[PDB]
Design a protein around this ligand. Sequence first.
Ligand SMILES: *[C@@H]1O[C@H](CO)[C@@H](O[C@@H]2O[C@H](CO)[C@@H](O[C@@H]3O[C@H](CO[C@H]4O[C@H](CO)[C@@H](O)[C@H](O[C@H]5O[C@H](CO)[C@@H](O)[C@H](O)[C@@H]5O[C@H]5O[C@H](CO)[C@@H](O)[C@H](O)[C@@H]5O)[C@@H]4O)[C@@H](O)[C@H](O[C@H]4O[C@H](CO)[C@@H](O)[C@H](O)[C@@H]4O)[C@@H]3O)[C@H](O)[C@H]2NC(C)=O)[C@H](O)[C@H]1NC(C)=O
Ligand SMILES: *[C@@H]1O[C@H](CO)[C@@H](O[C@@H]2O[C@H](CO)[C@@H](O[C@@H]3O[C@H](CO)[C@@H](O)[C@H](O[C@H]4O[C@H](CO)[C@@H](O)[C@H](O)[C@@H]4O)[C@@H]3O)[C@H](O)[C@H]2NC(C)=O)[C@H](O)[C@H]1NC(C)=O
Ligand code: CA
Ligand code: CA
Ligand code: CL
Ligand code: K
Ligand code: NA
Ligand code: ZN
Ligand code: ZN
Length: 786
Amino acid sequence: TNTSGSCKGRCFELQDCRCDNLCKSYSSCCHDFDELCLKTARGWECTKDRCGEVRNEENACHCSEDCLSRGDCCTNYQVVCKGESHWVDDDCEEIRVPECPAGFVRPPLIIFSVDGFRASYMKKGSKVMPNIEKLRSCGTHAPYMRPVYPTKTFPNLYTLATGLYPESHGIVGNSMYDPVFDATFHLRGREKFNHRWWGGQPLWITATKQGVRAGTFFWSVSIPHERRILTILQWLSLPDNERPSVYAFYSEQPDFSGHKYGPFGPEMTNPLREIDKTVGQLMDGLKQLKLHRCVNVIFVGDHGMEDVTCDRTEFLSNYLTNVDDITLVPGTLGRIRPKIPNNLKYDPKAIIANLTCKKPDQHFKPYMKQHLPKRLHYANNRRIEDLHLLVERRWHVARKPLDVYKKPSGKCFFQGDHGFDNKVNSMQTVFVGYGPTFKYRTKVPPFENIELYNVMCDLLGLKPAPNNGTHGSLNHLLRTNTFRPTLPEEVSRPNYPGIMYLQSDFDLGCTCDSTEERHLLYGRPAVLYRTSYDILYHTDFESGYSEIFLMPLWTSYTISKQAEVSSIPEHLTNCVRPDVRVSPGFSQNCLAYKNDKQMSYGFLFPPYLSSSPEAKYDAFLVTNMVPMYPAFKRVWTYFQRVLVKKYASERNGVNVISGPIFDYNYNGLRDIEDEIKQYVEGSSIPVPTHYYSIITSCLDFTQPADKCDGPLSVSSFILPHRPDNDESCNSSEDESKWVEELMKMHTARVRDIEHLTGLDFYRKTSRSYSEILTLKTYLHTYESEI
DNA sequence: CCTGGACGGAACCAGAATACTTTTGGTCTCCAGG
Ligand SMILES: *[C@@H]1O[C@H](CO)[C@@H](O[C@@H]2O[C@H](CO)[C@@H](O[C@@H]3O[C@H](CO[C@H]4O[C@H](CO)[C@@H](O)[C@H](O[C@H]5O[C@H](CO)[C@@H](O)[C@H](O)[C@@H]5O[C@H]5O[C@H](CO)[C@@H](O)[C@H](O)[C@@H]5O)[C@@H]4O)[C@@H](O)[C@H](O[C@H]4O[C@H](CO)[C@@H](O)[C@H](O)[C@@H]4O)[C@@H]3O)[C@H](O)[C@H]2NC(C)=O)[C@H](O)[C@H]1NC(C)=O
Ligand SMILES: *[C@@H]1O[C@H](CO)[C@@H](O[C@@H]2O[C@H](CO)[C@@H](O[C@@H]3O[C@H](CO)[C@@H](O)[C@H](O[C@H]4O[C@H](CO)[C@@H](O)[C@H](O)[C@@H]4O)[C@@H]3O)[C@H](O)[C@H]2NC(C)=O)[C@H](O)[C@H]1NC(C)=O
Ligand SMILES: [Ca+2]
Ligand SMILES: [Ca+2]
Ligand SMILES: [Cl-]
Ligand SMILES: [K+]
Ligand code: NA
Ligand SMILES: [Zn+2]
Ligand SMILES: [Zn+2]
């Protein structure tokens, strides 16, 4: 690079040495970049004595009479010198259409992202943050926005830009080892600048591909905030054929002060006031350009902040005798791998056993990554280590003390940290959208940050790249430019078999001593791939029975608020009955379950909830049976016998849809073409990796689930089908003490279940479709309200 | 008031050497001295 050139007339140019706002991070600036592009003289504010000054090229910004036409006024110039008001002192006025100067072809978007802005900081209100609080109350806001896991900065910022889970965009932590590159990504170092780390298609690329020009989305750490704002405002003054339409501002605060003082320290007020001042400089500057009723502004955080101190550290050396032979990414999560990459003597089975339920109130839990809760979507990337530690909120994990023998000093230089499970309340962050395209004075329910990329594409007129948002689920944020979603097309249609076989046709080794109106409430699920399946009706339930898997894809039934739970008679404990509607060759068989000494079986519709002794015999049909480990039947039985009825009594009836999931390669997608790796011994009955249930009722619970007029209410889960209950440290006790807690950990979205099964639910309701897409992205988190 | 040392491996930051990732001292406050 020839740094002998000059940045004269090129400062922060958007197209030899460089003068853009990343040259410093690459060490490519022309020698006079600092002198010409980072002026600082006289600060960032006009004063009464500067009004009408003779222009002086040394000043950071100008208060001369010409600064308006040259677009380089201080952001407060009009207020101090021409009698105008600060944007924050003006009334809220609805913006029904964009009010943009001639030559603007579309409303610009400015993304204002803050680091470590916990959702509950908004409770400080206008006394601390008057500009932000006016954006929030005049625009559209969520009470919180859910980040992705791990709740660290780089995974979340790049999720914001791409709409992808970290396992898909590839930035799975702030530091990473990639065994194929054999290289390490680190915030310190040049390797992170290599494009091979960064997957997906971020918004600035989507924009350029479709004719929408982008400003920078990265800012060099040494460029002060006021200068970033003034640069964006100067870009917005460029001619129509050079001006960008999408911009990004980033602040590292208030993350650093949160680390030092903690989220509840009175010291948090000052960094929040400082951010608010920068927001006020932007809004005043836009008002000075006559763009304050033309630009869409998004104020968004990457994650929250939790109380974490030195008194709450677990050390792996208290569990493992050789912590020198492993590498640990520590803190609010744990990722473990061998010190020597691909070391053949690395034994994660011995490691995980020593880390499982070893101390009474142990403040982390180990997982092989395929056993993490599916809602984290944190497994399908070679940069994610197989061995993972989920750390309890407010705690850290560390590798080992330096000197195990030294005394208690009581010195701690930090009080906050982030990185925990993304459903923890302290990790939630902020979302505000203000402008012509967002709604006016509107509160919307919490939503996940993977959904934002689609919205930003809608605000710019862009077709999104394939991503993990559900396009249309945030239409209720927008006054216009909504996306019109359409139902996925159904690929397979069901057969409806009648009675076709005799009992005597079956040699399964088994022994035994208004259906749609009632049990399928929202239409049958569509099967979105080619397959042969049967729909089977019974008094108490309906099912879609797969000929390939030899079991239901789904089973649907409605349990009313007054339903009765009954016992299985002792003479029917082991009853299994051939189904005369379904061929012997497309049935499971009981011999395979006897021969398999690890596998038992359960039922998708529970016999416990049968409507009469006669109807109960339907529950023992071989077409209702599914393979289950004995340890898992403890969970599933408690769900069926205890929890379904409880939910029915609390929600005024429930509709339940349950079924198997196969995801042996842990990519979150229904698996296909020989990816299933386990079968019941000697048979072609595949073994599920998970079981799901979707539990729906009326949002207005004064109406019974089967007679619901308005919006629906849903909760769901994806339970891992494990041969032991090692995940639950007190599973040796009665199920009342651990099963429900386990289920809450594995809560899921209906959407997560659609990916994993290839089914599409809620196809026949009386609701608009965009409302159903919102319902399908809902996650019941079991957390108190923020 | 001044200097040095410890803090403790967990947070962030910004100096080095281990050499652009990895590792360490500092942070604030107290202790020891002059
Ligand atoms: C969340 O949303 C994302 C985006 O839609 C979904 O991920 C997509 O999933 C599909 C289905 O598996 C993948 O399709 C397959 O694509 C490959 C070609 O892949 C290359 O080209 C695409 C298109 O440009 C790139 O996006 C891919 O990028 C991956 O690799 C680069 C370089 O290695 C890396 O930097 C990226 O981060 C990214 O890695 C991630 O994806 C891969 C899987 O591709 C995964 O292994 C990794 O760990 C990360 O997760 C890539 O450069 C194509 O060969 C395949 O063909 C197969 O299917 C066809 C039928 O379609 C068969 O006929 C054929 O014989 C093959 O068997 C697939 O089409 C797609 O790559 C992937 N996209 C991304 C960006 O990840 C997720 O599934 C969604 N998650 C959930 C839970 O819904
Ligand atoms: C998983 O955890 C197990 C159990 O902690 C662990 O096995 C233990 O490893 C240590 C280290 O090898 C063993 O060694 C100890 O070290 C001394 C000498 O240096 C031995 O004399 C000790 O025997 C004493 O044991 C008593 C314990 O207090 C002493 O008080 C007594 O005086 C004995 O002399 C002791 O052996 C330790 O023995 C094992 N324990 C068992 C049950 O094996 C294992 O290494 C861990 N695995 C992994 C992968 O980390
Ligand atoms: Ca799969
Ligand atoms: Ca040290
Ligand atoms: Cl990380
Ligand atoms: K068995
Ligand atoms: Na257990
Ligand atoms: Zn962050
Ligand atoms: Zn942080």
